[PDB]
Amino acid sequence: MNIFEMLRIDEGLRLKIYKDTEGYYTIGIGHLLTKSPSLNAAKAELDKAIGRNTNGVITKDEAEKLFNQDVDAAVRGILRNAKLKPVYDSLDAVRRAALINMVFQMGETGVAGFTNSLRMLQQKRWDEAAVNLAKSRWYNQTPNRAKRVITTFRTGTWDAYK
Ligand SMILES: [Cl-]
Ligand SMILES: [Cl-]
């Protein structure tokens, strides 16, 4: 298992514009297009991202391409963030993937906001961090996915994904 596979399971793949769990326009493997309510604004963002007049539908290769970019962006944002970087640096490979997943879903800012949990992860207090991470809107809104990510942090294995 690896980050790409992990995220492909968490996000699925849609080749036609769709609305995510929060109601925002998305496409592909979890690629958020816009938070505006306008399908047109979404279509425009899509075209601009893809580089062609898409009519709201893309190919598998187009999706995979956005996906590669988005994962690269996530890691680079972690590495550029003063709060996230030290955490990431401290973790083993599997857990690093768990952190990228959270950033991928919620954004660097969002994750940087889990101050207390981050500190716990940094300290390697797995069980405590898992409980702290559970007390969040994130967990409450997307419990199954959150559970998978949280188990990954707790255990340091891919069990939740197999
Ligand atoms: Cl983009
Ligand atoms: Cl979920």
From Swiss-Prot:
Changing E11N: Loss of 84% of enzymatic activity. Changing D20 to A/N/S/T: Complete loss of enzymatic activity. Its EC number is 3.2.1.17. Changing D20 to E/Q: Loss of 99% of enzymatic activity. Changing G30F: Almost complete loss of enzymatic activity. The enzyme is destabilized by 1.5 kcal/mol. The keyword Disulfide bond does not apply. Keywords: Antimicrobial, Bacteriolytic enzyme, Cytolysis, Glycosidase, Host cell lysis by virus, Host cytoplasm, Hydrolase, Viral release from host cell. One of its GO terms (cellular component) is host cell cytoplasm. Induction: Expressed late in the viral replication. Belongs to the glycosyl hydrolase 24 family. This is Endolysin. The lineage of its organism: Viruses, Duplodnaviria, Heunggongvirae, Uroviricota, Caudoviricetes.
